[PDB]
């Protein structure tokens, strides 16, 4: 079998004498280890800085050495064996971290948050406003491109999520947009009526296990050919502070976003419709709650779900929608299909209107 390199373990910046460990496999009959200025293709790559003193572990999958003097700033690190060669990108200094995706912009305290990005090595802190994450709850993938943590006590309002490493800081603005909440079953909005609907406040012992105060459940047995079953018919508070959502914002740039916990997986058939301010003519139909993060239903975990506001409202600006008569936020579950019966158990909270 041919050698390969999975990763290189080292502390930054890499100075003369800094220990490195090449992690991979099949390091049999090593003939040379060297840094090269060549990238992408190492055919006839120069031996820019050779490593003459190194050790290999018992399973031939880890090579240890101290950085030679005169180390290149960037290029490739190469292990040349009898069979073939393996190489990996190398640079002496850390790049700043970056964040590409977050599992939710409003994670519930106590739940697990997932972040995708790059260069998560040597984490110093994870912060959100005036809150800081307990680093004992953090797990980082081996490729330093994914991490999880436990959401701490909630921030006081819209802030930046920030991951700080020894290499720098990555920031996500617009995090925890409490000012944009239109219905939370606590201080904002109210439940009006609905079949199969009951309020729930979690305490750790039963689904949804954690909750932001009161949430509402839709649950029960949903038969086949059921055209009227579960509803959450709610009064929402649409008067978001203009400092957090300008009046002239295009509705094409906004989403209705909420948290959803699906406790029991269900098959094809059951669907939700959503409509606002009684405008059934512009309802969004055939909806299955799926995570913005994964694109799929994540059974047993709170998900963030977004629906474009332009799929729900006739108005072209946020202010014009605010001026429309009424206040309702409605969700209705049916099963217009031959399939079933299905046991349903789902929870909803923290409806907000936010920019996409
Ligand atoms: Ca709530």
């Amino acid at each position: 079998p041919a050698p390969y390199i999975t990763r290189v373990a080292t502390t930054f910046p890499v100075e003369t004498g800094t220990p490195l460990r090449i992690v991979g496999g099949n390091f049999y009959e090593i003939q040379r280890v060297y840094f090269t200025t060549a990238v992408d293709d190492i055919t006839n790559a120069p031996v820019s800085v050779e490593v003459t003193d190194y050790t290999v572990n018992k399973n031939f999958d880890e090579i240890s050495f101290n950085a030679p003097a005169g180390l290149i700033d960037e290029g490739s690190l190469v292990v040349e064996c009898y069979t073939a060669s393996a190489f990996t990108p190398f640079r002496r200094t850390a790049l700043p971290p970056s964040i590409s995706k977050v599992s939710s912009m409003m994670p519930i305290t106590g739940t697990t948050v997932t972040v995708l990005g790059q260069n998560f090595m040597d984490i110093v802190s994870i912060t959100m406003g005036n809150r800081s994450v307990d680093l004992s709850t953090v797990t980082v993938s081996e490729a330093n491109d994914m991490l999880t943590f436990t959401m701490p006590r909630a921030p006081q309002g819209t802030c930046s999520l920030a991951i700080t490493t020894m290499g720098g800081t990555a920031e996500v603005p617009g995090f925890y947009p409490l000012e944009n909440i239109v219905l939370n079953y606590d201080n904002i909005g109210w439940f009006s009526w609905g079949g199969q609907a009951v309020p729930v406040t979690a305490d750790g012992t039963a689904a949804p296990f954690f909750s932001d105060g009161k949430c509402y459940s839709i649950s029960g047995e949903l038969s086949a050919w059921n055209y009227w079953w579960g509803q959450l018919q709610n009064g929402a508070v649409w008067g978001i502070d203009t400092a957090f959502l300008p009046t002239d914002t295009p509705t094409s740039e906004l989403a209705l976003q909420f948290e959803c916990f699906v406790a029991v997986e269900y098959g094809e058939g059951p669907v939700f419709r959503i409509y606002l301010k009684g405008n059934e003519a512009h309802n969004y139909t055939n909806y299955r709650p799926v995570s913005d993060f994964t694109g799929k239903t994540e059974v047993g975990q709170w998900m963030q779900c977004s629906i474009p506001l332009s799929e729900l409202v006739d108005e072209t600006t946020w202010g014009e929608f605010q001026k429309r008569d009424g206040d309702e936020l409605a969700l209705q579950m049916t099963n217009p299909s031959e399939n079933g019966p299905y046991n349903i158990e789902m929870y909803f909270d923290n409806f907000r209107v936010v920019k996409i």
Side-chain angles (χ1 to χ4, degrees), residues 108 183-188 200-201 211-216 302 348-351:
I108 290 167
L183 172 64
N184 68 9
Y185 301 121
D186 297 296
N187 56 314
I188 310 296
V200 168
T201 303
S211 74
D212 187 352
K214 186 178 304 187
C215 68
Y216 267 73
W302 281 102
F348 296 88
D349 205 354
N350 283 337
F351 296 83

Side-chain angles (χ1 to χ4, degrees), residues 2-21:
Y4 64 98
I5 298 173
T6 300
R7 58 183 175 103
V8 177
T10 193
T11 51
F12 291 101
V14 182
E15 308 282 350
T16 305
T18 295
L20 295 93
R21 193 186 293 181

